[PDB]
Amino acid sequence: NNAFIDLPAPSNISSWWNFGSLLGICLILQILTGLFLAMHYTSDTTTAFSSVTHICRDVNYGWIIRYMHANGASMFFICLYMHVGRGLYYGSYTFLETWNIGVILLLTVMATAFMGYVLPWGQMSFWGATVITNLLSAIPYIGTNLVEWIWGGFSVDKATLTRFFAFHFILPFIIMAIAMVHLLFLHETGSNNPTGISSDVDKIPFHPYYTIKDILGALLLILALMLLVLFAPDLLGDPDNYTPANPLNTPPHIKPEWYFLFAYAILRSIPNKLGGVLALAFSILILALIPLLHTSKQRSMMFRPLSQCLFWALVADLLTLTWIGGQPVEHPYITIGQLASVLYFLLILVLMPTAGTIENKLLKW
Amino acid sequence: LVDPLTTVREQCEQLEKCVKARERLELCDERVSSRSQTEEDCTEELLDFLHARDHCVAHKLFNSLK
């Protein structure tokens, strides 16, 4: 009660507000499947890949737990991006504390998924570990030292894998605690709603209205997840990780996990090391700047046509970046990627705030 | 013993798309072989031909296999 059952909720929140509970479900499903995997996984580089195949081949139902964990990570990101998109479109980021904790949640889930991906020790695992940890080398003076410290050596090796298993194991739990704070902060104000207008004059109890909508949403999430696990378990994965890590050879068409492609396209768009790492970091941290770039007198984009167009341009641009990240660094992809990367920051830093101001003038305030 | 693959390939090579591809390939062969020095080869023409032919073969072959 007054924490759940009698929690006052806007009477008009749509399906876009289901993603918060879906993220919670994703987290729990990842933790449960992950724990069962951890019961059979060994992190020694000589047995990591083998232990994963053993889970998939000889552990009763090991394959289903393994593919649920893998596709669960994808479902997690789909829900994350929807969740963030909802927040941007509806002006939810004005709940500053909740939004900033959200930004930290995003970075932590990204770090977590990255490390988990290294555990099977396939080719993508090894090179992913190499490239991502090396992002720290762009830091002046101490970068290289930080990398080798993280690695526990001069290269990704045994020490790296063992500590990544320990980090992967504990981070989800830290994520859960942080998510609880994310919620505590949200309960102080209650939810925003599609109109962006206070809904204090029309609240309804969380139960039964949203408890039942949440269950329905959860069923559709389970449906999406199981359709992937039971009918296309490898659809969202990379065939290259079915090949054990080979430190003397980087696959020629290597590419990141699909949910990282846009950021990868951005980093890859800049022919400068520090420049790319800074843009990659900024592509995510710009989220923390959105609240400061809000110029509109109205909270939600529902009543702002110009902002909506730009918002959808941004979504289409992230789709463009996601597509480019999946292509070779060759013409005309190099240029499309650089333009898309420029557009991304242009939309967020200039065009959207400008549109906000223009709409204000059109409404005479 | 006759592999149906041989049969199916012959029938498939009859299609216009394959005959056209085969002709561009034979043209390339002539052009390339007539030289002593050239960095050109006919891989492109061959792949175009194989693509047209194997697409057809894939639609029929398994009807002959157990």
Binding site: S11, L230, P239, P252 | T43, L46, L61, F62
Partner: protein, 241 residues
């Protein structure tokens, strides 16, 4: 070259959403692996016991294991020794290590095939096209010694000479061993080897669809039931004039 030729889509009998693998085909495919592929390719994650109930009976798989000799021990004197294989043994590796493998294959390394189908874009369509796709190099192409032209292989120059051809082996069921038939069965077997859970996941998929086909409309009806109270509510504003 940098050009790519993607494999077409074959109508595998296990291609459909609810379509299982053809187990007689898996059985023949194993024979192909056993007589042909195994002399150069390992299959590290498959053991004889895995064949039981899939394509061979327990007794047949036991006899297959016994056809080979595997090192065991140490014995009481601290010696390694040879013994007939058994169900728990994994398929024998053709080479002690990848270096020996490369040395015995002009520098090229025959990859392990336990997952080849899942480790290659195209899956069995790719392996099938590769296996039945060798041809003479196009005019202008010259491959270094040891390499063969295969249009489906990246770069078109592969270090594996065509491994199958008409009558490369005799099947236990009389099936005409043409090259394409042999390719089709070994591909089916490779799919199973890379994904033994294949048939089970589709059977569960069927049950999952049936359950969701029931539960989704039911929960949706419950949602509409509860919400009807808000969906039809009417508001009136009556301020004192």
């Amino acid at each position: 070259s940098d050009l790519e030729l993607h494999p077409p889509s074959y109508p595998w009998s296990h291609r459909g959403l609810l379509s299982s693998l053809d187990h007689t085909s898996i059985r023949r495919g194993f024979q192909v692996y056993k007589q042909v592929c195994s002399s150069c390719h390992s299959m590290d994650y498959v053991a004889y016991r895995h064949l039981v109930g899939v394509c061979y009976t327990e007794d047949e798989a036991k006899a297959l294991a016994e056809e080979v000799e595997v090192q065991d021990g140490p014995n009481e004197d601290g010696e390694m020794f040879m013994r007939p294989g058994k169900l728990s043994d994994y398929f024998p590796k053709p080479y002690p290590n990848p270096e020996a493998a490369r040395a015995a294959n002009n520098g090229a390394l025959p990859p392990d095939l336990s997952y080849i189908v899942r480790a290659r874009h195209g899956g069995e369509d790719y392996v099938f096209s590769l296996l039945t796709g060798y041809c003479e190099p196009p005019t202008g192409v010259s491959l270094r010694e040891g390499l063969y032209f295969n249009p489906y292989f990246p770069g078109q120059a592969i270090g594996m000479a065509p491994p199958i051809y008409n009558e490369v082996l005799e099947f236990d069921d009389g099936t005409p061993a043409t090259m394409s038939q042999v390719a089709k069965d070994v591909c089916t077997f490779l799919r199973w080897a890379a994904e033994p859970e294949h048939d089970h996941r589709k059977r569960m998929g069927l049950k999952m669809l049936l359950m969701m086909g029931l539960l989704l409309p039911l929960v949706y009806a419950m949602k509409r039931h509860k919400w009807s109270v808000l969906k039809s509510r009417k508001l009136a504003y009556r301020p004192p004039k």
